[PDB]
Symmetry: D2
């Protein structure tokens, strides 16, 4: 049977309350033992080990955890015995963790993030099925070299494209620019597409010696906008700013002036959009070359932040970072 490690970043996504008997197997983490008791069919698919990487809600995630998780995933996947890793994660920032891993995991072996929009105690909890399906995706031959994937609601989403698009629905995850790459229905895995943007083993980024990521703030644009938030990000040591602009990444004039000053000072300014989908394009209304900005193209603000953070580990050159956004 294939060997898989489940890494938990918080509590159980499946089941609730104490175990009905004390297990003879220790997977390596109590959270994971609870998952194996709550979804026992997964034991027939794989030999499961468990680790607890963090113990937080995903809204409390930090770069320090991202680095710890990525370094551990790389170690695990370098082992001959380990076929895949599954990470259980809160849904709120799952997309940011998945995208970070998609650029930092140096392996073609599957890495699957999974969570639950309803708590395990709830009526009609989604976690048990989502986890069962995640294991099936992780052990599937066709999952190799698909990049980091999010598995939710019977769907397989590429990390580059995935986002949480709804506050509460079980079907909150979507890939608004491309769609799911595959499906998983009662464990039956089928892929229909794959990303043509480089990831994982093909990514230039390497975080193995990084202990802290560069600070990148995100700003929300609107009518009658301000310069004070740009100024405060500068004052706090921001190395980059994502601007979630109006429509196709457009700033309000006062804010544009402050961002221009930021970029002149050596802080990378990258234009995204508040709208939810589509590309924040080059050569539209904003003269990025003249102003010293980068266009994030077909991402969203929070994933653009992750990419800008990685880019800033090695360069602040506007052209090099535009090429990064135009590649990954």
């Amino acid at each position: 049977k294939p060997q898989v490690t489940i890494l938990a970043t918080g509590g159980t996504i499946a089941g609730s309350g104490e175990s009905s008997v004390k297990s003879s197997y220790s997977a390596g983490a109590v959270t994971v033992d609870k998952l194996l008791a709550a979804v026992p069919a997964i034991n027939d698919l794989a030999t499961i080990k468990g680790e607890q990487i963090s113990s937080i809600g995903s809204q409390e995630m930090t770069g320090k955890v991202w680095l710890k998780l990525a370094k551990r995933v790389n170690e695990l996947l370098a082992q001959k015995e380990t076929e895949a890793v599954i990470i259980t994660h809160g849904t709120d920032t799952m997309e940011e963790t998945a995208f970070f891993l998609n650029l930092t995991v140096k392996s073609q072996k599957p890495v699957v993030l999974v969570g639950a929009m309803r708590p395990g105690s709830s009526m009609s909890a989604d976690g048990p099925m989502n986890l069962y399906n995640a294991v099936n995706v992780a052990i599937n031959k066709a999952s190799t070299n698909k990049g980091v994937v999010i598995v939710m609601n019977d769907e397989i989403h590429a990390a580059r494209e995935a986002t949480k698009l709804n506050t509460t629905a079980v079907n909150a995850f979507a890939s608004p620019n491309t769609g799911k790459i595959g499906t998983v229905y009662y464990g039956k895995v089928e892929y229909f597409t794959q990303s043509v943007r480089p990831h994982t083993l093909a990514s230039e980024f390497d975080i193995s010696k990084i202990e802290e990521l560069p600070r990148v703030d995100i700003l929300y644009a609107h009518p009658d906008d301000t310069d004070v938030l740009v100024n405060a990000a500068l004052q706090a040591g921001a190395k980059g700013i994502i601007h979630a602009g109006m429509g196709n990444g457009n700033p309000f004039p006062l804010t544009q002036n402050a961002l221009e000053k930021a970029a002149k000072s050596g802080v990378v300014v990258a234009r995204s959009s508040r709208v939810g989908s589509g590309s924040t394009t080059q050569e539209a209304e904003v003269d990025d070359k003249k102003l010293g900005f980068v266009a994030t193209e077909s991402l969203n603000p929070q994933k653009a932040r992750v990419l800008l953070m990685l880019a800033l580990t090695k360069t602040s050159d506007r052209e090099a970072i535009q090429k990064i956004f135009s590649t990954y």
Copy 2:
């Protein structure tokens, strides 16, 4: 024939270049004369007058223009001869202006906002059809008391529900929580639903004596978030803050602490979400009553901002503002 006024807030959304002859009719604004020359079929539907309210891209909109536009719309709709108003508007912030008007226009006569995702000079420009359709909606008997509507891409969207959800597509407008309320296809208007949330003549808000709206900032949440943007909004005199939270309106802890301090100081803190759709609900993970926050429910950050601005013209009381979010 019905009398309609078109109010322009920027340039022409239809046609391009100089007129092929100097018209004998002056509608009242050069922009509108250019529209009538570009889309002549509209002259057979209505007697059109025109005014230029502002001359800006929608990303440069301000509360001063909103107040001027709302006051003029109210004057026009009080006239017995005026059956409807159409407003040509940039797409970027059309949703904000429409929502503002939906709560400040004291009339059941139709108010239609309309724009173009492609410039009038473009191949396959969408403005001409959008405008033609907008006129048809404005004069239709069934458009009375539907509230302010956005007419784009053959669809009629209720202002409360509409948003721009794509950076570049002609079909960028959506109503992600409810759908379009009607269709307009080569001028044929059909309504299938209407909003049950109060608007227009039923709204408590009145801006007739207001010269400046309350300052409301918006913040974009993410992992490893900060307190410095909250602090800078306070320092700049913010009367409210919309927090675009992670998932179902969740803040990062450092930011939550700053927002709690803000709320205690009498700055209203309203929780929305960065995700795109769904309600930012009460009684989920955030204890709003204990922390002193409002849950914006089924809006998005930029429209919640509008509603919080209007609320702040009347009150800063947490319970009263929650009731406003729970009503409108």
Copy 3:
């Protein structure tokens, strides 16, 4: 506590296996007693009675059952004590039953259809939550006069607009032309819109003395299409034919000729579309007046069939039936 009757048309949508003790309450139908044991929170919301109207999968539904169900719903809602009816139903044809009821139930009291995309025995079964939410919708004050609604996946869909749009997903139901009219999240009910098309108490249709509905067939259009299926429907006594046409309701020429002959013979031919959404419009490529056809407008083939069946209970006049499609 409000009194509600649950009518079951098949098996349990929630729970699985035998009861853990023999209940002291008999709701009136074993299926319903099993539902109350599987979702016990519903007993705190309402006094529930149960009946078994049929015992079938929804793919085996027939007009005979539709008539039995509608007549019973009308009887129940005429009782002073009965506040609402919930019907548990298979998902496959739930939209057809809901639409039929929306035109035949002569009451403003709520009628809610609910089902489950996963069996009650499944991991992460959706039935328990869907039922819980259905009860909450049924007892909600704002549900009065909303027409027949489908409650699935935390959403409230108007019967006129609802369809099953996916083969397996828990979120398979949608209203592709208008969206959900409301939401229901852990029992909290909110409406955002309502239908402006007449239903229920305002419908002209009355089935109280009808024992069999008129035969209406549906045909699926494609390239290199045929006349033999039109001919066989005629031969079998079809009173009406829905043609699920290519694009905006377009037939292949051989098929068009056969439909023209059908319409001349007194069989009503109504044009819908195979595409999934939008209106099959009048005055597009097909000259409906000349050919003797009706345009179904903003429905789909299966719901158009239901409406044509009801129309044919009293008329086969082309113009009267076009007015029916243009009204309901």
Copy 4:
């Protein structure tokens, strides 16, 4: 400059009326000359030749035209000088022609289908931009080996996945199971995914010596369904039947019995769904092995028809055809 041939299957999708001067260039077909006059920017991108393959609306398409078009595309793409083919096509059945070509074109050179939801004479006609974008996609280096694509509304759709899902919208094309594979915005082409299902040069099908395709009918399921349409398809010599079932491909019992008889007689019965999206799966409620049916999985009825037609040129064996549906 790259050489491209445009093949027209009907009239012009761009421009309208007579030319303002008689061109000195003849592209080879009057339709294509009219396109070059309507969209002159395409002449700077490629050397265009034109041919008129057929002169019909897409709702009049037949297998004879498909065979002529596929054979001509194969000849053209075998020429060293020809870099790509573009096919102008009515929207109604574009998806069927694209899917057919995706399995019969033996080349990795780009094949792009393109049409217009509005006539060229219309206000805000979409043909010009669609065609301009189609040319850009056809000449793009990254379009090699993507399979046959549909380019509409600034989107690139894989032929396997594309469908027309709305009757009238300019954005009617979608890929409901996977999404667009790329974008094309004012000619700027970007791919984000590709199909992992074999196509074109990797397809087993070869139609070079085929003069007539096997007859395949499609049936629309509903409650109170019949056996007479199955029987009439058998009588007319159907070699396969696509059943557009209720929900996850479910038949009504009377119809199931007729289909079982059909299958026993050696007519292939393939289960799809009327719903719109999702897989019609194996091992759900229908015992395909016992009844002698194929499950079409993640297609729709009209594309399943195409694939079943091509399958029937090689085999009628149930297992072999299931493998074909499970591969392509």
